[PDB]
Amino acid sequence: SRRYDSRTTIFSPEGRLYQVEYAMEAIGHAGTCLGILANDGVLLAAERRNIHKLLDEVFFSEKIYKLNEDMACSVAGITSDANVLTNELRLIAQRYLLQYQEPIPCEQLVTALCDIKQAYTQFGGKRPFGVSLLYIGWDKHYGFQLYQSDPSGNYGGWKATCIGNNSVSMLKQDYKEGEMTLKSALALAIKVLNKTLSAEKVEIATLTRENGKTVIRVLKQKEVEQLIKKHEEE
Amino acid sequence: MEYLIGIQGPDYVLVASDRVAASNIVQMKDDHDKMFKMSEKILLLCVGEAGDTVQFAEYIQKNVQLYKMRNGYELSPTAAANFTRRNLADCLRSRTPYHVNLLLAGYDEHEGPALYYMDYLAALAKAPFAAHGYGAFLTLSILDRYYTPTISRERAVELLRKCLEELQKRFILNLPTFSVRVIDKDGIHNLENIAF
Amino acid sequence: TTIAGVVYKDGIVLGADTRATEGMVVADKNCSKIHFISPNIYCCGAGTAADTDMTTQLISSNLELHSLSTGRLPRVVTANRMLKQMLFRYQGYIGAALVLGGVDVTGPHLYSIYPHGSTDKLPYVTMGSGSLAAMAVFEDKFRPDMEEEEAKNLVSEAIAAGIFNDLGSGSNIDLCVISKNKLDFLRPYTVPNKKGTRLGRYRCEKGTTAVLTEKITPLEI
Amino acid sequence: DRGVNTFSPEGRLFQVEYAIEAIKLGSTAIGIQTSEGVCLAVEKRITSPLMEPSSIEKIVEIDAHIGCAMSGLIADAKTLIDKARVETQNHWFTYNETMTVESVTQAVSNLALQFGEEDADPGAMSRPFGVALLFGGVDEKGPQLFHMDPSGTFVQCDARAIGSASEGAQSSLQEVYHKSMTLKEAIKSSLIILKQVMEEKLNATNIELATVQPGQNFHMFTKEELEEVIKDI
Amino acid sequence: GYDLSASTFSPDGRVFQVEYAMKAVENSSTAIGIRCKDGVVFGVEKLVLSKLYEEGSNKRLFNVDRHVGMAVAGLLADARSLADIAREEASNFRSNFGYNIPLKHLADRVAMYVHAYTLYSAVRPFGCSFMLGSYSVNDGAQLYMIDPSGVSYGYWGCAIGKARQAAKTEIEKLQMKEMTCRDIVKEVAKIIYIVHDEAFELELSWVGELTNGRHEIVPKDIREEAEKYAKE
Amino acid sequence: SYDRAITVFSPDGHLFQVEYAQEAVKKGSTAVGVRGRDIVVLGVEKASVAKLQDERTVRKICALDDNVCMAFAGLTADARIVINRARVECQSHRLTVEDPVTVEYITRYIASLKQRYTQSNGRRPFGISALIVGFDFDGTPRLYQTDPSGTYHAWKANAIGRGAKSVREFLEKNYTDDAIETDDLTIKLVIKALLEVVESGGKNIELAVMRRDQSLKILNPEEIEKYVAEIEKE
Amino acid sequence: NQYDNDVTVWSPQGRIHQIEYAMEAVKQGSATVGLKSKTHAVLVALKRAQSELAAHQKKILHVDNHIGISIAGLTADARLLCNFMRQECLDSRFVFDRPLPVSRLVSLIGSKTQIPTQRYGRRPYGVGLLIAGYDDMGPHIFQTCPSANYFDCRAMSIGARSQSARTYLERHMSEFMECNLDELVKHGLRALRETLPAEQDLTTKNVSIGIVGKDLEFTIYDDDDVSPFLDGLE
Amino acid sequence: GFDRHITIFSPEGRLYQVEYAFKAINQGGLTSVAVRGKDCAVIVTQKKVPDKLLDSSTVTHLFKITENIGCVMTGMTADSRSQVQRARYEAANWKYKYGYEIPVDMLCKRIADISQVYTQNAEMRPLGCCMILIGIDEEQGPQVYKCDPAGYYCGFKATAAGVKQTESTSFLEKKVKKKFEQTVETAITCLSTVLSIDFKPSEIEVGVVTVENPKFRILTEAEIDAHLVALAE
Amino acid sequence: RGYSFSLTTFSPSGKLVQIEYALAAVAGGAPSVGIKAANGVVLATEKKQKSILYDERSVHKVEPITKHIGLVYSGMGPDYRVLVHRARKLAQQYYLVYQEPIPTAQLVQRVASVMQEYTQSGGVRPFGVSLLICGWNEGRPYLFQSDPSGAYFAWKATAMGKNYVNGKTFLEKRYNEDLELEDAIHTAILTLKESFEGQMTEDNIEVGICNEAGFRRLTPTEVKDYLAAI
């Protein structure tokens, strides 16, 4: 009945979308995982849920998801929805291969996912996908690149943007846009996460290469105990 | 029963069609040009059934043209060739078999020139030189005898004139003019048509 | 394919030869034709080699979903009726002349499923071409209410009589014995067909090859 | 709120009597059936002067001998103008003749009160078409114009005014028309537009006029014909 | 506001869109049906508004399957709708199973139809009580009555309508079991003239041994014979 | 399958969902275009993309096929669907009639599409507004401006962004005949018109030009500076 | 009034609360009167002129091949209902090759306009037909209603203040079943000439009548042909 | 918002439709108590005719699912026959689809599961009737089950259903901890000790199944009359 | 028929109002413990009925998914039974296409995938059953929990249902990484023994283990056996 519908696909009298900016406040409750690119490859830097021992082993974490040989994605907000959509977008990646025998240049993928997620906020009367997930990737066309999207639908090349709480302004006083030298990108990542820390309560993951094929590393345990002692002051 | 030919150079690939639009007993206007302009550097050719050549390959021209003028850059000829192999291969068995066999000349910038080939069953294979039609059956050994893997441009053109003068001499169909286009690292450039 | 199965006082004894011959050449000399459905129900298979596989994966999966939905052990009547109704509505395009047998809470009994969907409760069945080579040895020496050991010997003599004078012969006999308490799925029961032997070694070492281009690729590190 | 298929405590539908409004909003159009033609005019209400005024289509020719004149919520008519011309060439296709004006007006007005929330496939309409229009056309019966409503009600008309000037221009048109064309109904109708004037003295940039005469097919007037008429007033 | 939707219960378990449909047949005229050993006799009250309506302006004794009947009470649109789909239901039974439809199965079928139509907010309940009635050669004079709730009971002398509070008493005091239907056709007028307390241009139909499993408006003679039960 | 009628007539003929889309285009960027009689030209004051943007994927300026190109203004993710369907049917209109597709027809397709979303069952008509510029078979550098009610107008300035009522009254004041030359006075009029609103073009403005059915060229911020300097010099 | 979301609901007394209000919506419509003789039934309608002048929104309609109607309520909904009634009357001409009898006609439209009264979010057909035709027996005449409850009546009047026409026509039923065409339609026009606002004339413009019965097609008398029916002074 | 309107979660859980549907099964109240015998699952219920004008044979609860499963339900009798017809449908569908006749447990699982999908989806009310249903399979003893309108079948010895459920299950709990094929001091005496009528053999319906004869049998006033005069100990 | 509009929606705070109500309906459910152990798990739960009247061999709460994967719940009654129905069906799709028993992780992927669209998609309310998963899958056992949101996490021990904070803190106190067989059963029994509302009857608890030979329920003669060995 028309008394019962939440009426998600309605413009406000101020013109905005009520169910969309409620998803934007869902990101600020739970969300971390910045991403830094360099002249070399790109990394995510992430946070787990809490200190609660009672957690045996994650193959990959609940944060960094593999998508192709040359792409990966990280997730903010509601974790139940995005899992679905990331499997959804994973399907998209593979069928581009089936249509083209190319490793899907990542802007095609981000455009496709943002079109279907825009389609859930356009009609159907359903709630929008409450996740502002972001993407890292490489293609032969462009360089190493990361994109960042939100439950509204728009996206962009967001060279050092983080998602979730405590919002990135320090990064737009510290990132050198020309050259970055990915070891120092790790150093800047543990700087920002050191302000906002071993791999019990951090989840950092890099994307690099050797001889053409890309390598997605999840930065196993003892590397984090290296970088956490790479400070004195910061 | 038409004729398509192509030769892959070291930094180019040249194709040539027969410039004859046939009928039951007679031939129509010669030109009708079979080589369909793709984005900037891809160029495919189509013979076979009279009515699926102008239909299928133009639809492929629509989708690849939409890809370039939708997302900036164009396709490499590998993805265009596997694209049209997918589209013909899944339009094959369903309801209306598109009975066309394609050549697809092309080159990417940061890899070599490629000349893809497929039958009417959409089985794709690279080739340094490929042919089509009934005229394929006699002219292909001249591209076996003389084709080095590295060949200059004018040597390949006069080799192509050897192939067309043999095709003029033995093959029973009146194919008097042939449309020739060399594509290479400055874009689709077409040489003057060969006549007799 | 020569197949068979005999009911007896405790249970049933299935049995099949193991050879699958596409065209007029054996593609594979040792394949199981006695397919699992259930810890109390084994079927068999003849006709199309793939259609029996897929129809008993489907009825195996759907049946043990059914049995763990009920909680008890699944009966063999419902396997007969799911194979009958699911095999009927494809109008016999599936060629699967399979028999199936089971010990259950009512009694040990077996059915035969013709590829159009006609079912027969019988004391003894034979599908495949080797039916004809293995039905007569159920007509001179079959007795009702017979003990397990000469029933095993009976079915081995039946399938062994489908070996020696049929061109859908098999390498070796495997047969399952489904009783009230124990199941005995034994692979090959007898091997009446040895390979023979070769005479004289053949090859040199790092010769007898026209190598045009090698290529080596390591894997681990 | 309440839905679209509900009746109002006045007596009529909600969405229909709300679709009678947003006809007061929008430009004004007038039409006069005569004995030797039918003239249509509309002051299409240009907003800015920085611009091009000859692409505000408010006189649209359905066929060669049917021209409509819409107002109100503009560009909501394009689906039913599309249905008008597709139905027109379907009639000429299947029957090899011209049409009436009550057959195109019969065919369009069936689509007016045809909407609803829960119905067949979502290519249907939700709101009613909030555009009132009138088909000036010539037939083998006679020249005539059929004033539609958004309710699907269409009536025979010989002098009808729509838009915001549906009271004063209609009452002025009620007392100035009885006889015939003789070239001056088109000059005594822009005179009604001259009384209506909102922003500008009705030059050949802000009014579009077109006549349908039985000899020709139609005539969408160009600029020098219009300002030839405006010079005579 | 626990009202206005049939998919929402009360806080004491009482779906108000059903009991609002039940009073929606209590503001409509009576239609009594009396069972006896040779068949079931119907009789419907009529509340003729103007002289403009002619005789049988609205049928309220429909028939369905050439033997069961349709004395209806409430909204004649809804009652006429389920009358014609009862016609289609006995059509699907006779076409499907050959054997002529036993009435218990038809009353259970139309009963679960109008009940399963009260489980959704996307439909309203029906607003029409109605009753059936016939007999096969070995059935007995079966009649059933169906509420807008969808419950169907076998009765002897059920009466639905506005004045069913009066009408149930005389049918209870009438001798029910053993009389041969012709007298009770006559006696039906006594019930209808008692319960009408204000043109009462009534109408009767039955099924009986004078009919052999059929329906007739009376034939037409008791309309000038049971009219002679005025002054009682 | 959601079938609630959203875009419904309220009283006094007011179709509130469409005017809510009118604030939704009132709360966007500030797009502007000039029909400059041999050239056409756009411009949209962009935000802080220099801090950490990617300029390649901040494009309010897209391209439909080669000659027609549009600058949307509002919600920036419902627009990209209309971009995609414009490109798709534009290729279909290259399939049938095989022309350099006229700008009138594609803007009638956009206005007809948005009007088809003011009609269907429950899908929230768009909050975008276009500047369909381009050419045709014979010059004629026609500009078009659509609307969320699906009404397109063939006007010549149509500054329809967020602070663009001042820009369109400025362009009403200062566009008569001084911009009939090749490019310089027209582009000077555009960058003057957007420098009315914000600050310098080294961080804010970006433009695009189109000349006689070739060379849709954007202007990198090194070149925009020269024009900005000329305007400043005045 | 929570009974405004309302062809699903019941008022707590008995009322369905808007399909009797559709009966109000045909009380609001224009007045008409039909009647029947022993031989041929007639229909008479006055046509409202809410304009300059018109054909006054022609009421009585040709459906048939002797089963004619007289609408009074919504006009587009009336035309939809007579395209239904028209199309299946011609379908009974097609299949059975007999005249479709009037009773089954009015009963199955009485089951066709009954469906939106039943289901959700669909208004009833707010039109009061006054159909009249000559089948095998005498020429029937049926009022039907938007409450889907037709009436096998004789001499019925529906429309604006038509109750006075009924109370003339109720006390003059005795001279029906006689009274041939020339003196019958006079007896119907002087029944119609009470719904008018007490000022003098059934003009030839506004009165359109229809005749149907023995050995004559359902025949429409328009502006000219009603002029031979002339008499009465009151 | 709509916690007590739609089958959705309120705060602190407790979706407010199933306990509004539980209160629906107490409407009027014609009350079943089911007795289980290590060899005989008897059925008891009370049934009141209003006015000696109903046909007492036609009014019942006591339906027959198949040749081995009987049932009795105490909910609102409108929702009863829509539920028992689907149970007959799934019984015959089980016998056509899986061979053997359906055993009593997963029948009640299945109608409990469609009652679940009533109380999972919106736009349908969870219909208020609970199905006391008995039956014997080959393996175990006689069983009895009751799915509620929420779908929670349990597997009972001796519950009851209808008005006065708590007094009945208290009496049965106090009269089962002592240890009954005759069921003469258990079956009727639960009713006569809860609501104190000490029935004549009209108003009580009894449906037995026995291991020696698994066909579901509804008893008549002769054998239930001997069953009642056996309460003279 | 149907609604085709989601009743689960976003609050003005920015959170799902229905899902926290679903976790409330879980938290008002019967308490259930689950202990991942070095070779195998134990998933205990508490079956307190109304009276001593019912058949405690009739309904189960430990019940397998067709090969070696049992799953135990806490919360709504029959919504669990729907999730067992869907879970068995998904495990049999996987078994008929890939011809192995399903990895536990993939079964939790697909069960969390089917529980997501009931937080969307047309009038359906979310399930409100946070059932937990077991499974031997090759080499080392697994354990999971699909919340009525659709999230899932793997660990070494958990509890759920009533007073589960005491279960999580108490299992955080008494857990060892090598603690493997029947000692896990021991601490599971003395996690349900913590409240139980009284007397620790063997007919009111049931456990299920995954001792490298398929998930299997424990017979009621075995739980009372260790209830004799308390």
Author numbering:
A (entry chain B): 2 to 168, 172 to 200, 206 to 243
B (entry chain J): 1 to 196
C (entry chain H): 1 to 221
D (entry chain D): 9 to 241
E (entry chain F): 6 to 203, 208 to 241
F (entry chain C): 2 to 235
G (entry chain E): 4 to 237
H (entry chain G): 8 to 186, 191 to 244
From the paper:
Consequently, cellular homeostasis including diverse functions such as the control of the cell division cycle, transcription regulation, protein quality control, apoptosis and many more pathways, depends on its proteolytic activity.
We then proceeded to reconstruct the three-dimensional (3D) structure of both the non-inhibited and Oprozomib-inhibited 26S proteasome at 4.8 Å/3.8 Å resolution, respectively. The Oprozomib–26S proteasome structure exhibits well-defined densities for the entire proteasome holoenzyme (with the exception of Rpn1), showing numerous amino-acid side chains in most parts of the molecule and relatively small variations in local resolution. Specifically, regions encompassing both β subunit rings and the α subunit ring of the CP bound to the RP, as well as the ATPase of the RP are resolved at a resolution range of 3.5–4.5 Å. In contrast, drug binding considerably decreases the available conformational space and creates an energy barrier for the molecules making it less likely to reach a fully rotated state. This is manifested along several eigenvectors (data not shown) and indicates that although a subset (14%) of 26S proteasomes is observed in a rotated state upon Oprozomib inhibition, the maximal amplitude of rotation attained is only 20°.
